[PDB]
């Protein structure tokens, strides 16, 4: 389970102390917001540096399933292994985050859910409605794992140029609440 991931961390999201994993903590969220724009789904990501150094990651694609009726939605952020025999998910995210909250807007409602250290708060829970469909996702890395939890935005901007060029058309805005500083990536092809 996620325990493992906890106790040998850099062996999931790459090195604690260089970083290499805090910044893959970043790019393993982001890239599902990727796929949702590859598949045909999303036009708009953005990625907050917030004071506290936590970030946010928000799409405008289907949002996760919620399939009730232990949500879908929670068996992505919280399970390790998927069965059987590259990238290792967000649940290692989820893991390395003391807090870390999910909000999904889907068929006309808001849902949520909150974890720390990957463990579930509460059920994922109808919270409102919306208009839109999309995903959020909050994360604050545990200062127990990275002990420099200082991202950086030339490592961040860097990668995301890269991934502007795969999907032309998608707006990809980097926002660094920290400095007031943010940019629009956006490739057109
Ligand atoms: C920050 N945004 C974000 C984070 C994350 F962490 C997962 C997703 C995400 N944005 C998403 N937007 C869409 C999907 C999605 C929705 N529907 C499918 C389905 C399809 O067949 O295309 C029906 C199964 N796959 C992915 C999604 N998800 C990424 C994994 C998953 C899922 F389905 F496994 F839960 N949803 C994410
Ligand atoms: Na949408």
Same mark, same amino acid.
């Given at each position: 389970?996620?325990?493992?991931? !906890?106790? !040998?961390?850099?062996?999931?999201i790459g090195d604690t102390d260089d970083g290499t994993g805090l910044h893959h903590?970043?790019?393993?969220? +982001?890239?599902?917001?990727?796929?949702?724009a590859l598949a045909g789904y999303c036009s708009e990501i953005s990625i907050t540096i &917030?004071?506290?150094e936590s970030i946010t990651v928000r799409?405008?694609? !289907?949002?996760?399933? +919620?399939?009730? &009726? +232990?949500?879908?939605?929670e068996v992505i952020?919280?399970?390790? &292994?998927?069965?059987?025999? &590259?990238?290792?998910?967000?649940?290692? +995210?989820n893991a390395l985050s003391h807090e870390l909250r999910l909000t999904i807007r889907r068929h006309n409602k808001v849902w949520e859910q909150v974890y720390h250290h990957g463990v579930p708060?509460?059920?994922? !829970?109808?919270?409102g409605e919306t208009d839109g469909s999309g995903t959020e996702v909050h994360?604050?890395?545990?200062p127990e794992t990275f002990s420099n939890i200082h991202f950086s935005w030339d490592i961040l901007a860097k990668r995301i140029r890269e991934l502007s060029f795969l999907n032309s058309g998608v707006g990809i805005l980097l926002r660094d609440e920290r400095t007031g500083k943010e940019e629009l990536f956006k490739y057109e092809g």
């Open positions: 389970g996620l325990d493992a991931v !906890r106790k !040998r961390p850099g062996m999931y903590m970043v790019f393993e969220v +982001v890239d599902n917001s990727i796929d949702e &917030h004071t506290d799409d405008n694609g !289907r949002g996760i399933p +919620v399939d009730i &009726h +232990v949500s879908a939605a952020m919280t399970v390790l &292994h998927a069965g059987g025999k &590259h990238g290792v998910g967000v649940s290692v +995210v708060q509460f059920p994922l !829970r109808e919270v994360f604050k890395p545990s």
